[PDB]
Each structure stands twice: as C-alpha cells, then as structure tokens.
Design an enzyme around this catalytic site. Structure first.
Site, short mmCIF file in Angstrom:
data_model
loop_
_atom_site.label_atom_id
_atom_site.label_comp_id
_atom_site.label_asym_id
_atom_site.label_seq_id
_atom_site.Cartn_x
_atom_site.Cartn_y
_atom_site.Cartn_z
N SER A 236 9.84 38.97 132.04
CA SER A 236 8.81 39.26 133.06
C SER A 236 9.45 39.84 134.34
O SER A 236 10.05 40.96 134.30
CB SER A 236 8.03 38.01 133.27
OG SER A 236 6.85 38.37 133.89
N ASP B 209 9.05 41.18 127.69
CA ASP B 209 7.76 41.36 128.40
C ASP B 209 8.04 41.70 129.86
O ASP B 209 7.55 40.96 130.75
CB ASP B 209 6.90 40.11 128.30
CG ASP B 209 5.61 40.35 127.53
OD1 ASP B 209 5.39 41.50 127.04
OD2 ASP B 209 4.84 39.37 127.42
N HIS C 260 2.43 36.00 126.65
CA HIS C 260 3.53 36.11 127.63
C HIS C 260 4.47 34.91 127.52
O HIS C 260 5.70 35.09 127.53
CB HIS C 260 2.92 36.23 129.01
CG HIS C 260 3.94 36.62 130.02
ND1 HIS C 260 4.72 37.76 129.86
CD2 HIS C 260 4.29 36.05 131.19
CE1 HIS C 260 5.50 37.88 130.93
NE2 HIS C 260 5.27 36.84 131.75
#
Length: 371
Positions: free
Chosen positions: A220, A243, A298
C-alpha cells in the site's frame, strides 16, 4: 497462532534493531534463517501503545484499543525470538515497508516465509507519522531505561493530503535507504549498540549479507515506498509492490526507475486512478510485471487476515473470497520467483515463474481494471 509458518526449509528467527536511539534513527524487525528451531514464541504486537494507535487509525476510541489488546496482546507469530543467526552463508536481503496505519510487526506472514527460503528481511518502522504508532528515545539514558517516546499516526485534512503524503513517501524512501546502510555497515564490521537490550548479538550479522542481492518490498503506502526508494537508491536491484497506493508519488519518479518492478494486486482494492499510475511505470526498456490475486482484498497481504475467523474476517474486510493461506502462498511464491530472476539466486524458486505471468486458477494476468 493462525499466522502461517514459513514454507521454506530454513528455520526462522526474529529480533528487533533500533540504531541510533533517536527519532531520526532506524527501527526495524529482522526475520532471518535461524541456526536452531527451538520455539515459535515471537510476540506479534509487542506493546500496548500499538493497540492504542490501531484504535485511533480505525476511527474508534479507548475501548477499541483495550478490546484489540485483550484479543491479540499475547498472540504469537511463528518465529524463534532472538535465535542465533544460521552461520556459513551470505543471505539476500529484503527491506520491507509497511502500509498506512500499520507498523513493522504486521507483515510477519511475508517476512517469515521469505526468511524460511534463505532471506534476511528488515521490516522498517517508519517515523513519518504513517505508522499507527512507533517509538524512539530522547537520549541514550531513556534507551538504557526503556523510557519510550511514542509517536502516533497523523490524521490529515484534504488540503494537506497532496503535499504531506509526498513528504512522507520521501522520508519513507530515506528510511528504507538508511535501514539498508545500517545492515550493510553492520555486515562490514560497524560496531553498533542496539538501542533495545535483547539476547540477539548484532555482531552475528558481520559478513552475513549477499550485498549484490538486495530488494525492497512494501504494501500500500509501502508499495509507493518501493517505487520512490528504487528511484533514489540503485543498491536495491528490484522491487515488489503489494497493492501499491500510488497517490503519494510525484510525476518525476515514473521515468527514474531502471530496476525491475513487480505489481501484485488484490482484486477488490484497485481502481483506475491508481492502476493508471502503475501503467505509467511501463516502458519497453524496463521489466514490469503485474498480477492480480482473484477474490483477494487489500488486507490479504497483512497479518490481520489470519487474526480472526472466516466469518468475522469477511465482515471486517480482513479476508476476501479466497482462502488467506492460498492468497499469501501465491503472493509469496510469485515474489520468490521474481526475486530469483532479478537477484540471480541459485535456488528452485523458478518453479513458480508461471505465477509471475498470472498463470494460475487464482491469478489474473495484469489487472481487471485495464490490462
């Protein structure tokens, strides 16, 4: 307890390293091949203040911090705490960057798996106020006493997000580069006094690093961190972005990354405005790969995906439609094949080269957005 053991043949140890003691020093959790496999006793979230920070990140208040603390305060992760480093070999090195609201201990399923395949992993704790919590010491005497100064996640206003996220990603890349310099300097005999007093003697890391085989991995915010760090630091020879959250990056980075880069996406997180920045990294003179794990969310890349039951997990968006162990095995195996290819490793990870192409029932080649 439900965080999976590494699938590789090496047994895995874990310790913490802070140097120097200050807010500008490096803080990391090390996962490494251990000589011996005596007990899987590493405490997953080791201080009450991370629970307090997770609660503030989640928007809840004080009761939530105590509830998480009650539920997970004694949860272990499967690594031998402070076990001696396995001698006799130079190990490839991964620097791992956590997401927004995370901290250094929350990607142990990944760190432990890599270590069980013969990597040393340095999971950094960022001091940019993107961690839910982190700590440092105001002086050597506070470190000697264990007198910790805590730093909690900074909530931003809208008008702040563009400038501050880019300042944080730049600090994050400096922290990844500094963590690498710390490990490389220790590898070459730099004397260090760990700011934390732990049974693991850091002198064991002398002449333990394969200095040509360095990668950066992150989730992330940490995926954006991979890309910024690669652009600034050619010691990192490839990157894997889990991600990636691309918003923090400035337009200047996209042309500035010579190293190979691998995007591993969840199916249910990604969106066009994010994917289009990933496609901006693509060039015929560069290696870029992208796969999407079918049915993943996620949180499939972080340890909370293994922290609850299947049903609660789905309601809290910690689990996807895919089994959490199936999803992390795909991400870790594809990661290993990619690291073997671009670090030149002499192992058998190329058995998963097909996962890099997305050739699996549970993988999408490229992205569902526009591939």
């Amino acid at each position: 307890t439900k965080i999976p053991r590494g699938n590789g043949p090496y047994s895995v140890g874990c310790t913490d390293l802070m140097f120097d003691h200050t807010n500008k020093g490096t803080f990391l959790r090390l996962y490494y091949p251990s000589q011996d496999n005596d007990r899987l006793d590493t405490l997953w979230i080791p201080n009450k203040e991370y629970f307090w920070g997770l609660s503030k990140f989640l928007g809840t208040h004080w009761l939530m911090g105590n509830i998480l603390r009650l539920l997970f305060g004694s949860m272990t992760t499967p690594a031998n705490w402070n076990s001696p480093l396995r001698p006799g070999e130079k190990y490839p090195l991964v620097v791992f960057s956590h997401g927004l609201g995370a901290f250094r201990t929350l990607y142990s399923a990944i760190g432990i798996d890599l270590a069980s395949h013969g990597f040393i992993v340095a999971a950094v704790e960022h001091r940019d106020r993107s961690a839910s919590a982190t700590y440092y010491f105001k002086d050597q005497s506070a470190a000697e006493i264990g007198d910790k100064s805590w730093l909690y996640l900074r909530t931003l206003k809208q008008e702040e997000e563009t400038h501050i996220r880019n300042e944080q990603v730049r600090q994050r890349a400096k922290e990844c580069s500094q963590a690498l310099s710390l490990i490389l300097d220790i590898d070459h005999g730099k004397p260090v006094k760990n700011a934390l007093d732990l049974k693991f003697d850091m002198e064991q890391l002398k002449d333990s690093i394969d200095r040509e085989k360095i990668a950066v991995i992150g989730h992330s915010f940490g995926g954006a961190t991979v890309i910024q760090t690669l652009s600034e630091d050619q010691r990192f020879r490839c990157g894997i972005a889990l991600d990636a959250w691309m918003f923090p990056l400035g337009d200047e980075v996209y042309s500035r990354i010579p190293q190979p880069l691998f995007f591993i996406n969840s199916e249910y997180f990604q969106y066009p405005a994010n994917i289009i920045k990933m496609k901006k990294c693509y060039s015929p003179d560069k290696e870029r790969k992208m796969i999407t794990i079918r049915g993943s969310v996620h949180q499939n890349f972080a340890d909370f995906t293994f922290a609850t039951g299947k049903i609660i997990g789905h309601m809290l968006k910690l689990k996807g439609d895919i089994d959490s162990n199936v999803a992390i095995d795909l991400s870790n195996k594809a990661s290993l094949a990619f690291l073997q290819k671009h670090l030149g490793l002499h192992k058998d990870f190329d058995q998963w080269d097909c996962l890099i192409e997305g050739d699996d029932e549970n993988l999408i080649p490229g992205t569902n957005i526009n591939t």
